[PDB]
């Protein structure tokens, strides 16, 4: 494979070699794994070649026959490899799911899949539960029935690993997904019928907590005002307004809903009446009364919003305040080996974080007696974060397996993520952590140093900075950096640390975690790493990244304020490390991590392809663009170039040290740094 | 006994230090509080440290 | 200003264009230029009006009249304007911006829209017009030199060095040697093939001069074509004799003391009419008139609140 | 309220550990008695009975007193601290004073100005002597930030190696390469960093340029032994025996014996081992190896017991600071 490569002559020879290897040793995991991987790659190569040739009747039938001939051995080998490995079968399981969803509609392939499912153990599918649930509504009924049967089996054993995603799918806007989710849930109820109801009520009440009616009205009025005044989209304005009134038609259910109705609902109904009069007549004087009422109630709720510092359960949702000693386990805490930690009680008070999105701070009490804090995110998808967390788990496992990485104690800090809806969801709250921006601000306030000193110097030297050309921006940025001492982070690390013995360990952990996360983010194409988006632990010192909204070079692609920085390595972090700079722990740790990942490129590639080819996450790609298949293929090819090292120069393959050196030079380059948005804090 | 200890250590083999690893506030008070508040804090901490255990039976 | 045979216009981030006097060094008048700074100042060969390149707008100010409003404000552009050219006829004005689209402007025509568009991949950093008035040199942030023919549109793309942003490129009036300079600080020199009708214009790499260690800003040949001044972020303007490409005179504005950081960049170069003197702009807010042979500040221009980023010079009679 | 303070400061008549311990106790008790804060002063009676009470409250009492002092008694106290640190240095008092200095550094008051530069060099020396390597690394990094010197880089590499941070030492070496060129980089840096190939190249070039010297030749021999090229090591040993002084002879003897053992020349092995001093762990080890080769089992067992007796001290010293 290394020398000849992949082509028509190579495949039979490599296949016969691996088949002989399997024959001489049945029990060897590596032989079966390599055999299955080779067959899968052969299938992909044949599909790509036929796509390139025929598209650009009989040939289609011949291709189908060849693919069917190569598919079944791949499936059987993957199942056997899963059985043998027993613990590190995530890559093989995901390959199984890919083959199942791509070619399972064929009766022979489906028979192979059902035979493997019968042969394989149930516990393995806990890793790929989300990938299974991503394809609940597959148009092919043959695959769908097997998926539903497998999910019924999963509900039978370890039901806790399936309740949350089933509950999320049940409330889906599309009819087929929610229908199949309810069809699985009715079968699951005959087992317990209690876990399902508890999950349903918890999900509904948590969704109610995450987004309140007044907040929904606030955002809807913002969107409607924008549409009407900028785009003159009256029809779109009405379309945005109507679901809020439809939700009003349900009527109040809690004390907060009753108070909100008594306050605003009469004005809202009057404005809706005016809108209906406008719809039946078409008069500006009819719509202006509704607009005046909307703006009045909008001003009232805007004034009210800052006063909403904290939320109590008794007003927002007494249903949760009623909950006691539920069998329902803490979200993101169930483990097939560990004892189930079911929820004991919910704290009556939720401290809403005063942010743009206003996330709540929910804290649960477990059956074991340990608090579990969570953040209630509103109007933002978490499935992307779920896949990111799964990838981080795989990376942690790979780093644990490696001897050198384990020796250096390299790991990615990860927090439990539990989606609840397309807009709302649950995030595990990591303790003893705070954003880099907060630490910088606190240190500068303590030292009486102006918080925005660098930007102020830039504006003083050049008031037209944003409109300067590239070289002028470079000159201004260099002048600002030179006239500022960028040792704030290291100084505050030394001051915060109790003793130098703890200080050095914290600095070492910070350096190693930062290097690991930088390399992983570059491979993942994670962007928008502004100082508020990454948090520093105050005890271990490990760097933690959150808000994985932008992925796969989205920041580079977007035309407004594009980012040329693969990963944040600004001079503040550089000074925070050893006095020597990046050449010490950081660069060597990056070498080790890149070597480990390039060694295991297959597993990370499979995990990435799983949720890149996922239809539920292709909307981000379409928003990035300006079809779907070419975009996903290009993204996967870019990831492949990153892993192999052919990203910088397609013709020339790059070794790990040179690739890391180029990454560091690019990330630390002043020319690439000054293109960043000011809020990204390049000077920091 | 020193010879026996060294001999048994050698017989057991030089364990890899990582294998050994896997086999197994007052300054913060200064950093947080000002001096006027720090002095009672550290004083109370030390007095509590003495307060526990049998050294109390003497002090 | 216009009546004076010597015109020296200086402008920067202070939104003002100041016309000093070479004999005295006194700011004759200032012109307001709001909404942005200026990226390039150029005097038309006719000397009727000067041209100031800013951000998203191209302004032209009268040279004879005093305190005029912007005569022509060519709008419809974005992503700054890197530099501006001018046909010797005075009919066509050549511009390039960071939108990776060079544009050609007909001054005589009243149409606001440009006439010819040459689009490339990377943002354009410099544009230089060949003395033959038939070929246009276009730079880019990827370092690929484009030789856009004004008659056949046959652009030849040459990249002296991969993945280095080219900053400036100029050709001597005799069309003997062409110098190009990138952010690395190297001075790439191309011998020009004697082809006008043939349009061969083959570039023969003669010498890659390590002109500067840091970012190099701008290069330009002397009218005698024997001297080559080279600016950079090193605060040093280096003068190379064309025959030998050796540093005959280095114009530096360093403090002469280690206890001084970031004095200010130097991106100004203008030979005198007889190459005896040289005008240099810099970020120190102080343009300086140097002596070529000795290397001393014959006259110094001061009064700019913010950094000086452009210049204008014309000794045409 | 500074008379007994001055008497405790300018005593400098301690010739034993207990004398300095009693001096520290008296200083702490006087600080508690003279403490401006009543809460600290109330603990003086308890600290008299219980030493750890005084020890834990030492930093706060020192901070309060130093705030009280009007910049002259501060100078006297600083001079006394310098005298105590430099002269008759004792590990317990040294660590207590280092903890006090760190506590002052954390405080908003500022580091204690000791013999200028806040005594960074002295604090680093004391931290290295007392095996508090984290403080030594911090102070050496601060001294580096003040100004980088090749000696500072050497000390930093030594500290990192003593702190089990090979990557940090490699980064220091990379910085040295980038900034100081090559001449300033001694091969000892690679030797400590275990960059044996680079150390060998540096030794080869220095021996080619500079006339052959015992130190460079010994370093090259050490690099060869670490690499394991026994043939070249034995060639060098045989070539230079009579041209070698007795001190350099004994220093060679261990590596020469190792090379002979690697090559199996037992006659040369015996010749070299006889040159190795008996009071070295390696000497006893190689004598025992020779006894095993000659089947002198009783003498071999005796020599192994002697080697254990010698290694007692080394193991005790190393095991004191981590495994």
Characterise the protein shown here.
The PDB classes it as signaling protein. The entry lists the keywords zfyve28, EGFR. This is part of a larger assembly, with three copies of chain A and one copy of chain C (317 residues). Chain A has 684 residues and is mainly alpha-helical. Chain A is built from 31 helices and ten strands. A five-stranded antiparallel β-sheet of chain A has the order 2-4-5-7-6, with helices on both faces. Chain A has a three-stranded antiparallel β-sheet with strand order 8-9-10. Chain C has one domain: Methylamine Dehydrogenase, Chain H (7 Propeller), CATH 2.130.10. Chain C contains no helices and 28 strands. Chain C has a four-stranded antiparallel β-sheet, with no helix packed on it. In chain C, a hairpin with a 4-residue loop joins strand 5 and strand 6. The two termini of chain C are 14 Å apart. Chains in contact: A-B, A-C, A-D, B-D. Chains B and D meet through helix 1, helix 3 and helix 4 of B and helix 3, helix 5, helix 6, helix 8 and helix 20 of D.
Question: In terms of topology, how is this protein built?
Answer:
This is part of a larger assembly, with 3 copies of chain A and 1 copy of chain C (317 residues).
Chain A: H1 10-24, H2 29-55, H3 58-85, H4 90-103, H5 107-119, H6 129-134, H7 141-156, H8 163-170, H9 175-189, H10 195-210, H11 213-231, H12 234-248, H13 255-281, H14 284-304, E1 310-312, H15 313-316, H16 318-322, E2 343-346, E3 349-351, E4 360-366, E5 371-377, H17 383-401, H18 403-408, E6 417-419, E7 425-428, E8 433-435, H19 436-446, H20 453-461, H21 470-482, H22 488-496, H23 500-524, E9 534-537, E10 543-545, H24 554-557, H25 571-576, H26 585-599, H27 601-612, H28 619-624, H29 628-644, H30 656-668, H31 670-674
Antiparallel strand pairs in A: 1-3, 2-4, 4-5, 5-7, 6-7, 8-9, 9-10
Helix pairs in contact in A: 1-2, 2-3, 3-4, 3-5, 4-27, 5-7, 7-9, 8-9, 8-10, 11-12, 11-14, 13-14, 17-27, 20-21, 23-26, 26-30, 27-29
Chain C: E1 7-11, E2 16-20, E3 29-32, E4 40-43, E5 49-53, E6 58-62, E7 72-74, E8 81-84, E9 92-97, E10 101-106, E11 117-119, E12 127-129, E13 135-138, E14 145-149, E15 156-158, E16 166-171, E17 177-182, E18 187-192, E19 203-209, E20 219-221, E21 227-230, E22 236-241, E23 247-252, E24 270-271, E25 277-280, E26 287-291, E27 297-301, E28 312-314
Antiparallel strand pairs in C: 1-2, 1-28, 2-3, 4-5, 5-6, 6-7, 8-9, 9-10, 10-11, 12-13, 13-14, 14-15, 16-17, 17-18, 18-19, 20-21, 21-22, 22-23, 24-25, 25-26, 26-27
GO biological process, one term (chain C): cellular response to hypoxia
Cross-link (Glycyl lysine isopeptide (Lys-Gly) (interchain with G-Cter in ubiquitin)) (chain C): 298, 306
Keywords (chain C): Acetylation, Cytoplasm, Isopeptide bond, Lysosome, Membrane, Phosphoprotein, Repeat, Ubl conjugation, WD repeat
């Amino acid at each position: 494979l290394n020398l000849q490569g992949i082509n028509e002559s190579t495949i039979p020879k490599v296949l016969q070699y691996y088949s002989a290897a399997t024959e001489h040793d049945r029990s060897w995991y590596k032989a079966w794994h390599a055999w299955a991987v080779m067959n899968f790659e052969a299938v992909l190569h044949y599909k790509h070649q036929n796509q390139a040739r025929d598209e650009k009747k009989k040939v289609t039938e011949d291709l189908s026959k060849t693919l069917l001939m190569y598919t079944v051995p791949a499936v059987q080998g993957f199942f056997r490899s899963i059985s043998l490995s027993r613990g590190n079968n995530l890559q093989d399981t995901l390959r199984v799911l890919t083959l199942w969803f791509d070619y399972g509609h064929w009766p022979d392939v489906n028979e192979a899949l059902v035979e493997g499912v019968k042969a394989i153990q149930i516990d393995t599918w806990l890793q790929v539960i989300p990938q299974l649930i991503a394809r609940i509504d597959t148009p092919r009924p043959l695959v769908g029935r097997l998926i539903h049967q497998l999910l019924t089996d999963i509900g039978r054993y370890h039901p806790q690993a399936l309740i949350y995603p089933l509950t999320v799918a049940s409330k889906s806007t599309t009819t087929a997904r929610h229908n199949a989710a309810n069809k699985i849930l009715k079968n699951m109820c005959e087992h317990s019928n209690t876990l399902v109801q508890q999950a349903m009520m918890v999900s509904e009440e948590l969704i109610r907590v995450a987004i309140l009616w007044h907040e929904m009205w606030h955002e809807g009025l913002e969107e409607a005002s924008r549409l009407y005044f900028g785009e003159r989209n009256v029809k779109g304005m009405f379309e945005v307004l109507e679901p809020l009134h439809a939700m009003m038609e349900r009527g109040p259910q809690t004390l907060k809903e009753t108070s909100f109705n008594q306050a605003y609902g009469r004005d809202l109904m009057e404005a809706q009446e005016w809108c209906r009069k406008y719809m039946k007549s078409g008069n500006v004087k009819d719509l202006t009364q509704a607009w005046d009422l909307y703006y009045h109630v909008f001003r009232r709720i805007s004034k009210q919003l800052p006063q909403l510092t904290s939320l109590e359960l008794q007003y927002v949702s007494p249903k949760l305040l009623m909950c006691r000693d539920l069998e329902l386990a803490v979200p993101g805490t169930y483990d097939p080996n560990q004892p189930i930690i079911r929820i004991q009680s919910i704290a009556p008070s939720l401290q809403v974080i005063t942010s743009k999105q206003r996330p709540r701070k929910l804290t649960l009490m477990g059956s074991n007696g340990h608090e579990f804090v969570f953040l209630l995110k509103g109007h933002e998808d978490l499935r992307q974060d779920e896949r990111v967390m799964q990838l981080f788990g795989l990376v942690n496992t790979l780093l644990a397996n490696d001897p050198t990485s384990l020796r250096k104690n390299l790991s990615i800090q990860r927090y439990a993520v539990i989606p609840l809806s397309t807009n709302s969801g649950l995030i595990g709250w990591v303790p003893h952590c705070d954003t880099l921006h907060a630490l910088i601000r606190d240190y500068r306030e303590k030292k009486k140093i102006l918080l925005n000193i660098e930007h102020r110097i830039m504006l003083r030297m050049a008031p037209d900075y944003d409109h300067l050309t590239l070289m002028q921006k470079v000159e201004v940025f260099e002048h600002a950096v030179n006239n500022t001492a960028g040792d704030d982070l290291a100084k505050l690390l030394w001051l915060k640390s109790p003793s130098s013995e703890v200080w050095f360990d914290r600095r070492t952990n910070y350096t190693r975690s930062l290097a690991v996360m930088s390399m992983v983010g570059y491979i993942l194409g994670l962007g928008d790493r502004h100082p508020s988006n990454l948090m520093l632990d105050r005890l271990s010192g490990k760097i933690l990244h959150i808000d994985f909204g932008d992925c796969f070079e989205v920041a580079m692609t977007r035309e407004k304020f594009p980012e040329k920085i693969p990963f944040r390595l600004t001079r503040m972090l550089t000074n925070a490390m050893e006095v020597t700079g990046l050449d010490g722990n950081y660069r060597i740790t990056c070498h080790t991590v890149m070597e480990v990942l390039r060694e295991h490129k297959d597993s990370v590639m499979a995990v990435l392809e799983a949720f890149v080819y996922d239809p539920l996450l292709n909307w981000r790609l379409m928003d990035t663009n300006t079809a779907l298949n070419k975009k996903a293929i290009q993204i996967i090819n870019r990831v492949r170039d990153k892993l192999t090292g052919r990203d910088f120069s397609h013709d020339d393959t790059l070794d790990v040290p040179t690739q890391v050196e180029l990454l560091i030079k690019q990330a630390t380059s002043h020319e690439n740094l000054c293109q960043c948005y000011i809020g990204w804090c390049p000077f920091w | 006994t020193r010879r026996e200890a060294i001999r048994v250590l050698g017989l057991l083999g030089a364990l890899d230090p990582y294998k050994h690893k896997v086999n197994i506030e007052m300054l913060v008070n200064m950093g947080n509080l000002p001096l006027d508040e720090f002095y009672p804090a550290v004083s109370m901490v030390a007095l509590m440290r003495i307060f526990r255990d049998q050294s109390l039976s003497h002090h | 200003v216009g009546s004076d045979p010597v015109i020296l216009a200086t402008a920067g981030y202070d939104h003002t264009v100041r016309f000093w006097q070479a004999h005295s060094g006194i700011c004759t008048r200032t012109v307001q230029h709001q909404d942005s700074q200026v990226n390039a100042l150029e005097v038309t060969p006719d000397r009727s009006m000067i041209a100031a390149a800013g951000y998203q707008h191209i302004r032209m100010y009268d040279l004879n009249s005093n305190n005029p409003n912007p005569i022509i404000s060519y709008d419809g552009v974005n992503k700054n304007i890197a530099s501006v050219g001018f046909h010797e006829d005075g009919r066509w004005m050549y511009t390039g911006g960071e939108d990776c689209t060079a544009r050609i402007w007909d001054l005589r025509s009243r149409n606001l829209q440009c006439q010819r568009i040459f689009q490339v991949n990377a943002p354009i950093n410099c544009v230089c017009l060949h003395p033959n008035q038939a070929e246009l040199i276009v730079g880019d942030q990827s370092g690929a030199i484009h030789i856009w023919d004004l008659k056949t549109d046959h652009n030849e793309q040459l990249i002296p060095e991969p993945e280095v942003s080219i900053t400036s490129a100029h050709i001597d009036p005799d069309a003997s040697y062409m110098a190009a300079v990138n952010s690395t600080g190297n001075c790439y020199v191309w011998n020009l093939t004697g082809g006008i009708g043939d349009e061969v214009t083959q570039l023969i790499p003669k010498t890659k001069i390590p002109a500067h260690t840091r970012y190099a800003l701008q290069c330009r040949f002397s009218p005698d074509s024997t001297l080559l001044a080279t600016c950079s972020a090193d605060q040093t303007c280096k003068i190379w004799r064309t025959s030998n490409f050796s540093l005959m005179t280095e114009l530096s504005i360093k403090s002469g003391n280690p206890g001084e950081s970031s004095r200010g960049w130097m991106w100004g170069c203008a030979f005198s009419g007889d190459s005896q003197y040289i005008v240099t702009a810099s970020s120190d807010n102080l343009a300086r008139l140097w002596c070529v042979e000795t290397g001393e500040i014959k006259r110094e221009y001061g009064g700019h609140q913010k950094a000086v980023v452009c210049l204008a010079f014309n000794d045409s009679v | 309220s500074t008379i007994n303070l001055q008497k405790a400061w300018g005593a400098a008549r301690r010739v034993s550990k207990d004398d300095w311990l009693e001096w520290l106790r008296r200083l702490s008790l006087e600080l508690l008695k003279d403490s401006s804060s009543p809460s600290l002063r109330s603990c003086w009676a308890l600290a008299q009975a219980y030493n750890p009470m005084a020890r834990d409250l030492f930093n706060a009492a020192f901070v309060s007193c130093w705030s009280e002092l009007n910049e002259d008694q501060q100078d006297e106290l600083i001079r006394s601290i310098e005298l105590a640190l430099t002269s008759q240095d004792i590990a317990e008092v040294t660590q207590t004073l280092l903890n006090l200095a760190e506590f002052m550094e954390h405080s908003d008051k500022g580091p204690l100005p000791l013999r200028d530069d806040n005594g960074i060099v002295l604090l680093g020396e004391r931290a290295a002597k007392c095996r508090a390597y984290a403080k030594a690394l911090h102070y050496k990094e601060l001294e580096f930030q003040k100004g980088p010197t090749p000696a500072i880089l050497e000390s930093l590499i030594s500290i990192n190696n003593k702190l089990q941070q090979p990557e940090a030492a490699a980064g220091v070496l990379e910085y040295a390469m980038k900034h100081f060129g090559e001449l300033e980089i001694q091969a000892t840096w690679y030797e400590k960093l275990h960059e044996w190939e680079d150390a060998l190249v540096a030794y080869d070039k220095k021996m080619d340029t500079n006339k052959d010297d015992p130190e460079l030749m010994l370093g090259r021999m050490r690099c060869l032994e670490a690499l394991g090229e026994w043939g070249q090591l034995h060639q060098q040993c045989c070539e230079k025996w009579t041209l070698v002084n007795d001190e350099t002879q004994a220093k060679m003897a261990r590596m020469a014996a190792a090379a002979a053992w690697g090559l199996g020349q037992w006659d040369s092995m015996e010749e070299y081992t006889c040159m190795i001093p008996r009071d070295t762990h390696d000497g006893a080890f190689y004598r025992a190896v020779l006894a095993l080769h000659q089947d002198l089992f009783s003498l071999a067992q005796q020599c192994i017991d002697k080697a254990r007796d010698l290694l007692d001290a080394e193991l005790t010293a190393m095991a004191g600071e981590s495994y």
